[PDB]
Structures are given as C-alpha cells and as structure tokens.
C-alpha cells in the first residue's frame, strides 16, 4: 500500500 | 569487497549545476501549470532538483518527482535529471530517499539503468550498509540492469549475505534470492559465477517443486518453462570441456534439496503437511498449467539422483576444482580488476556527461528560440489587433 | 426503407399456412424482415414429400453465383440446401450431426439389446 | 425529394455541435473506462459482467501495462508475449513494442495505448501495427536472457495441398460448357487453393482503417 | 487427432470438459 507525499510549502520569506 | 574511492568526480558534479534559480519561481510555475491540466517540460523540474540545498527541499522533488510521473510528459524523464536526484541525495541522506523512490518504483519511476547503480552500491558499503543494500539490489534484478562491465561489484554483495544466512526461507525469500543470483550471475570468465547460477538454479527447483511454479515467474523475469532442476544437471554436464567451478555451495544446496525430496515423498504427514491455510477455495480455484503429456516432476525425482549421483563423482575426477574460497576469489574481483573496469568507465563517465551538457545548451535554446518567437507574435498581434 | 448498414444475404424466407410451411430462395438486405422487400427471388424449396416422396427444391444457379460474386452471405439452412445439391462441400455441420445420429442410433442398439438379454 | 413549405429546423442541428461538444470534452480516460472489480466481476462504468471463461484469467495474470510501468523507458524495443498464444500454439509469438503512451488518470500506472511490430508463427511484418486487446489480462514479459531462446524459429514448409476437386454438381457444369464449346479435353479441373489462404482466428486486425489505394 | 493437440483441448476447457468418444459405427442397424 503506497501512500502518496502530502502537499508541502515551497514558499520563501526571503522574496 | 570494497570499491576503489577513484570513481568520485564531483568535480563535474559542480559544472552540472548552471541554472541556480530560486525554487518559489519554479514550484509556482508548476503548480499553477499542473492546475491547469497541462504538459510540462523535464527542464523545470531538472531546475528544481539542481537547486536543491536542503533536505526539505528533497522531499519538495520527490513529492514533484511523484507528480511528474503523473504529468503528460513523464515518459520524457531524461537521464541527468534522474542523475543529478541521486547526487544531491548522496550529499545529504544516501540512505533513506533514494531507496524508497527505488522501492516505489511505479510512483516515482526514476529508474536509472546506469553506473549510479554502483554509485549508490559503492556509498551503501562506504557506510557499512547490508540490510538495504539487499534489498536495491534485490530491485536492481526487477530492472534487470546487470549489463555494465562492473556487474561483478553486483554479484559479490549477493553472495556475502549467502555465507550470513541462516535462516528457514520462505516463498519470497527463496525465489528472491535464486533471482537475485541466476540473472545477475553472467561471468562466464570465472568459476564463481557458474557456481552462483547452479546455486539459484537449486533454489528454484526448491521453490518449483514444493509448492507450484507460476509464482516463479509472476513478477520477476524468469523462464515459466518447469524443470528448473534439470535446468541445472546441465550445467554440471558442461564441465566435460570447462576445467573451472565453485562446486562447493551448489553441491551443500542440491543435498538439502535432495534430503527435502526424498523425506516428502514417503512422509507425507510431515513435509507436505505445511499447506492448511484453504482447501475449497484451492480446488474450485486450482489451474493446470501443465498438460497431460508433460512428465510430472514429482515423477522426475528418482531420474534426477540418477543422474545427479553419477555426475558430482565425474566433475571430482578432472575438474580439480572444489573449494569455498569463491568468498575471497570473488572478493579480489573487485579489488583488483573493477579499478580497471572503474578506469573503463571514467571516460564514458565523461562522455555521458559531455552528452548531457549538449542536451542541456539544446534545450535551453530550444525554449529560448520560442519565447522571443511567442513575444514577437504577441508584439505583432497587438501593433495590429486584425480579429474575425 | 433506408437502414443503416447491413449486409446482402441470400436466405429462406418462410411462406403458406399453419402446419404447411414453405420457403422461397430470396436474396434481400439483412436489415429487412424476413417476407419484406427484397433484390431478386432465385427458387424455392418445398419441406413437405408429395406423393413421389421428393421434396422439390430450385435453384437459379447462373444468378446463384451472381450474387455470390458481389459479396453476398450465406445464411445456416441455405449452405446445407446448396451442399446437398453439390454446389458446395457438404457443411461441417451437416457431417457432425450426421455422426451424432450414428452414435445415437449405436447407443440405442445396444442399450435394446443389453435389455433384452 | 423537397417541398415549397420546408420550414427551417435548427434546434436539430444545435443539439447535433452540442452532443458533440460534449462528448469530446467528456471522453472519458481509459483509467476509469476499463476500471474492474476483482470480486463482483463487474464493470463499474459500462456495467458489463465479464463471461465465465475469463474470469481465470483475470485473478492468475496481469495485464500489459501492469508488467510495463517497471520498465526505463516503458520497456522501448522488448519483447512482450500472451498467454493465449503460447498454450495453443508451439511456436513463439511476440510483439516487439516501438513506443508507448499510458494515461496519467491511473494511480498505479496501469492503462494506456501501445504500438509494436508482430511475429505469428515465426512470421515477421515490416510495419508497426497499434496493439490490440491490451487490457486482457493473459500477457507475459520475455526475460533478456530467453530473449534469443524464442527468436531463435525453425521454418517448417507448408505441407497444405495446392489443388483440390471441384464440388460434383459444379464440376459436371464445366465439363458440359467446354464439351459443348468444343474443348474435349479430358483433364480434371482443379481449384487454386493459392489465393485463398486464411490467417487464424486468435490473429490480431488492423485496428487502424484502410484508405483508398 | 494426435494426443497433444487432445491435452491441449483438455487444459484449456478444465472444468466444463465432457466425455470424449470414438471414431463412428460405419453402419447403423436397424431397432
Ligand atoms: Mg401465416
Ligand atoms: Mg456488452
């Protein structure tokens, strides 16, 4: 049984 | 077994990185583009790998790696970019992310039939790694990639853990383990790979003939022709002109087989007795793949000692050849001729990286040729909004 | 009528009252019923013996082959009618249900006579 | 056939571009098309019920695309073969794929189209053909090693007469046209069984139509 | 038929099989 990656955040608070 | 440290060149590793875009911009452009149901190229996620810092920015790749497997273009992964994944996990994890895509290899689909098969191989025995260097060994036999001149390196590792076993297998652990030797064991040069093949050959015969052969080859690419053990008596046959064999590990196996067939036989409340899990379900469901002309191979088994009896007496008398020192003759395989072989694919180490860095300036200016082309047609559209 | 497809088929077409059954050798689009319109009628074929024992059966073979020549089917009955009168083999199945009479006819023999004895 | 009083239906036409429409933006994906369950044997989509013959093969055999995803390149150039082949015929048959497309809507990866080259009975075709019936599951996969075990073919001639007896009745009908046209010979007429081979049953179509030549 | 083409029917149509039989009676008797 695979379970798929949850969503992550790539947003940066450097821009 | 240990590999020569001389195949590390990060060197050109440092060269592949050119792009060195922020990540926002490129997670953003996807996203949005995936929202919309449309085809992206392998160049945007290669730029989110080759901007990874981090190991959370890995698994923001193996989360985007998943999902490109599932984009329109997923056929169109190109070698570097699966490449390029394997080196930025070889700095940071080199243990956990890149076995378990390996492990998921429908999901992720990297699949890289190269030499970062020994690569990875060589940082897992750096690190004194045995458990999980099985097992990607074990899925290097599902992709069958035993092809390079360094399969040796493969074959070694198989055989330490032979010599650490000792253990009552099961189903999957006797068919993994003969498939994980028969394939893989190609050198006909040495002796030792001869004897690995008749030692998977055995453990076939074990598997066929307990149980039932159609699990033998469901999965992994094997041959559904039965008689796995006659398969092997004639590669004991061959010795009538080959002078060289391991002899000692394939003739301990064909004895256990032979004390499990000749006690299964007359004690069937003993042996044969194992299987209790379903018998309606196992009639009502049962498949003959065999015919009715086609010898059972229960039948088989007073033909094989026969034969097998004559044979082992036979090889003694000229093939001058019995001893367990396969352990160590295979060990100095790698020790000494793979830093030749390491040396044979230095230069195609380059050119397979010279051939990526073409790619690369093509595809670049394949995109760039086609933004001042969109540009210029927006320009013109607007100088002159001629609509219907 | 104007159908859709359908093939060009030459089949029997049934006729006459109850209990007296008739078929006529007619050569009609697939999709039409079975007494509706049709090309050309080749003969016919009578199911019942008359007083001789015959039963009479026609064929138009000039315009059999006609039609057979432009891609025509062939129904089940009509290829056992044709290879009765030697334009065609004899049916596989027309040899079939042969044997199995055979083989009936055997086992009714001797299951008599098991009896009998 | 028209008449003076042809009023001008258009509603006909404005369901005929909207059915379209719809259906080409509806189609559905193969994923969710040949979608089964295991137990019921039913279709969830179309709502058929495989016949009984199939459902052995169904639990004991995976179906192309299954034993395709773990492959590099989706297995580009290898050798696929079918279980329907090889328990009724001795000789080897195999497709040798060229290229090959699954659909993204599968979460497994297990559906999509495929192409190849086919050898039946040994015969090789110099064109590449779309692969039909792939979602059956009866296909197998060739290891790299038996890769030459089965290409390797021994060539049999054909041993099928080339002349066979007219049937009596039409026989007798060319005997009395040559007998009255003047042609006495007394030869037997024969039938050029040439023309009139016939390629077996289990043998895939052209799913692709054929334009004018 | 040869044996092997018989085996092949066999496996192929286990289960629903029904009882083979042998060449016909040439000559049928009358009852
Ligand atoms: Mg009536
Ligand atoms: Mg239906």
Redesign the pocket.
């Given at each position: 049984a695979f379970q798929p990656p949850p969503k992550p955040v790539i947003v940066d608070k450097r821009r | 077994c240990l590999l020569s440290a001389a195949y590390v060149d990060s060197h050109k590793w440092e060269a592949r990185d050119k792009e060195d875009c922020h990540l926002a911009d490129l997670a953003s452009l996807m996203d949005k583009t995936y929202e919309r149901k449309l085809p992206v190229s392998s160049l945007t996620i290669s730029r989110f790998v080759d901007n990874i810092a981090s190991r959370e920015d890995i698994d923001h790749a193996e989360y985007y790696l998943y999902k490109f497997r599932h984009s329109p273009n997923c056929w169109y992964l190109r070698d570097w970019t699966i490449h390029t994944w394997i080196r930025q996990c070889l700095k940071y994890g080199a243990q956990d992310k890149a076995l378990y895509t390996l492990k998921n290899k429908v999901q992720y689909g990297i699949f890289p039939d190269n030499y970062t098969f020994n690569l990875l191989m060589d940082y897992f025995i750096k690190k004194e790694n045995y458990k999980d260097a099985l097992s990607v060994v074990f899925e290097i036999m599902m992709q069958e990639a035993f092809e390079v001149p360094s399969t040796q390196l493969l074959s070694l590792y198989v055989l330490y853990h032979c010599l650490a076993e000792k253990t009552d297998l099961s189903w999957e652990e006797e068919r993994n383990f003969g498939a994980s030797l028969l394939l893989p064991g190609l050198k006909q040069k040495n002796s030792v790979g001869l004897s690995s093949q008749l030692y998977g050959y055995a453990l076939l015969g074990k598997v066929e003939l307990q149980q039932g052969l159609r699990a033998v080859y469901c999965n992994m690419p094997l041959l559904w022709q039965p008689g796995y053990l006659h398969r092997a008596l004639q590669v004991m046959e061959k010795v009538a002109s080959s002078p060289e064999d391991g002899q000692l590990c394939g003739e301990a196996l064909d004895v256990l087989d032979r004390v499990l067939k000749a006690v299964t036989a007359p004690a069937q409340g003993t042996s044969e007795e194992q299987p209790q899990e379903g018998e309606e379900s196992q009639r009502s469901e049962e498949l003959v793949e065999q015919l009715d002309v086609e010898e059972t191979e229960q039948s088989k088994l007073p033909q094989y000692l026969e034969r097998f009896e004559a044979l082992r007496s036979k090889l003694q008398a000229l093939g001058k050849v019995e001893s367990e020192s396969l352990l160590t003759l295979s060990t100095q395989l790698a020790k000494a001729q793979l830093p030749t072989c390491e040396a044979e694919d230095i230069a195609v180490y380059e050119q397979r990286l010279q051939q990526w860095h073409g790619e690369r300036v093509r595809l670049i200016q394949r995109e760039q040729e086609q933004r001042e082309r969109a540009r210029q047609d927006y320009e013109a559209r607007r100088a002159a909004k001629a609509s219907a | 009528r104007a159908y859709r497809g359908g093939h060009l088929t030459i089949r029997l077409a049934?006729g006459?009252?109850?209990n007296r059954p008739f078929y006529r050798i007619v050569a009609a689009h697939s999709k039409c019923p079975r007494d509706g319109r049709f090309v050309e009628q080749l003969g016919s074929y009578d199911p019942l013996p008359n007083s001789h024992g015959e039963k009479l059966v026609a064929l138009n073979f000039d315009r059999i082959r006609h039609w057979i020549g432009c891609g025509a089917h062939l129904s089940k009955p009509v290829e056992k009618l044709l290879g009765l009168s030697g334009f065609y083999p004899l049916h596989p199945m027309m040899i079939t249900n042969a044997e199995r009479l055979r083989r009936k006819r055997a086992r009714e023999v001797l299951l008599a006579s098991q009896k009998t004895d | 056939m028209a008449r003076k009083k042809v009023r001008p239906r258009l509603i006909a036409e404005l369901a005929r571009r909207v059915r379209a429409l719809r259906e080409q933006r509806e189609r559905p994906r193969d994923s969710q098309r040949y979608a089964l369950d295991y137990e019921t044997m039913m279709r969830p989509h179309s709502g058929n019920r495989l016949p009984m013959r199939a459902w052995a093969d169904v639990r004991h055999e995976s179906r192309l695309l299954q034993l395709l995803n773990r492959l590099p390149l989706f297995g580009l150039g290898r050798l696929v073969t079918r279980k329907s082949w090889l328990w009724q015929h001795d000789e080897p048959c195999y497709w040798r794929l060229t290229r090959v497309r699954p659909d993204y809507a599968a979460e497994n990866l297990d559906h999509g189209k495929a192409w190849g080259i086919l050898t039946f009975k040994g015969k090789t075709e110099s064109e590449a053909r779309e692969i039909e019936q792939v979602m059956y599951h009866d296909w197998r996969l060739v290891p790299k090693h038996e890769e030459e075990a089965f290409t390797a073919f021994t060539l049999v001639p054909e041993d099928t007469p080339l002349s066979v007896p007219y049937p009596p009745l039409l026989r007798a009908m060319i005997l009395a046209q040559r007998q009255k046209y003047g042609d006495t010979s007394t030869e037997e007429p024969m039938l050029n069984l040439e023309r009139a081979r016939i390629d077996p049953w289990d043998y895939p179509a052209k799913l692709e139509a054929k334009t004018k030549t | 038929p040869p044996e092997r083409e018989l085996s092949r029917l066999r496996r192929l149509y286990q289960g629903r099989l029904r009882e083979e039989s042998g060449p016909p009676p040439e000559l049928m008797p009358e009852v």
């Open positions: - | - | 049934l006459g009252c109850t | - | -």
